[PDB]
Amino acid sequence: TSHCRFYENKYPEIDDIVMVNVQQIAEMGAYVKLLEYDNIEGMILLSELSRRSIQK
């Protein structure tokens, strides 16, 4: 079974960097699992995700 956080603590901090693997999009943004800080889901809203076909 694949679990357990990468660092010492379970929950991330402020200003730190994480890599995410996407599962599903639309309606909210991306409530997706992390590959840098635990397998528990972390969410982005449809505003901070993009800057500059986005939904494609």
Binding site: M28, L45, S47, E48
Partner: protein, 302 residues
Amino acid sequence: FNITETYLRFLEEDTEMTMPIAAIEALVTLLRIKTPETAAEMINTIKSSTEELIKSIPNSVSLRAGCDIFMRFVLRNLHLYGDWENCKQHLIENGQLFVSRAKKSRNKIAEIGVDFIADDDIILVHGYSRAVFSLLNHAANKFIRFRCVVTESRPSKQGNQLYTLLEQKGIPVTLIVDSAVGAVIDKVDKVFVGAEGVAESGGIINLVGTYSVGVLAHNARKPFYVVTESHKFVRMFPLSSDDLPMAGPPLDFTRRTDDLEDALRGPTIDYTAQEYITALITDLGVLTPSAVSEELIKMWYD
């Protein structure tokens, strides 16, 4: 943080404040507890609330549409990407602000939509929508040249109520039955229909019959109308002649009886296509052909 209670509180009230508006206000209040910034806690909670609303809903999509609109608005809000408090404050503000907007919309309607009335033209208002009634009242106030006509509608006696309301004004009133509408082809000049939801392009949800009316209008080449204020913009499209979420069963051939149990079952809800309607009535400037779809496109980008 409670929505069933709110739903219970509002069903036959309306009049002063629109049914959907109250719901929107409630949603705003809910939002303004768990902070819009913390999107992890907030959006999930919103979704849960929507689910609850759906569960509590029998025969409606309007509330759902409203909440989707609210969500969209919220999403739009955070696009300033600078100071995070001002946006939050703005979000907090936009609830009673929405209510306020309604008055303004009504005022706008009372100025743009009052140009339509001509020499000897008989008006027939379908369904129940406050905006249409307000428009009618404003027309009466102007004293152009008209006739206000009612119907024999069948949900929980709505048509009768409408007729009674009309009586208050004083304007001479005669009635049209759901069946006896067939005789109307040119005598009643223009066919007006009130809305309880506006979808993509021409898609409108009301009460116990609109599609047939539209068809009749098409046959007669009559001007068909959709009349509303501003709170009903949906992303929806049906496949068949009619397709909707239903609590009242479609074509329920009732079980073998002799002493009566359950019988009042059929298409309680009605949709209309793009081709049948000639004019769209909203306060948002003067838009008609397919502006709502464009608006939706602008909003969703999905």
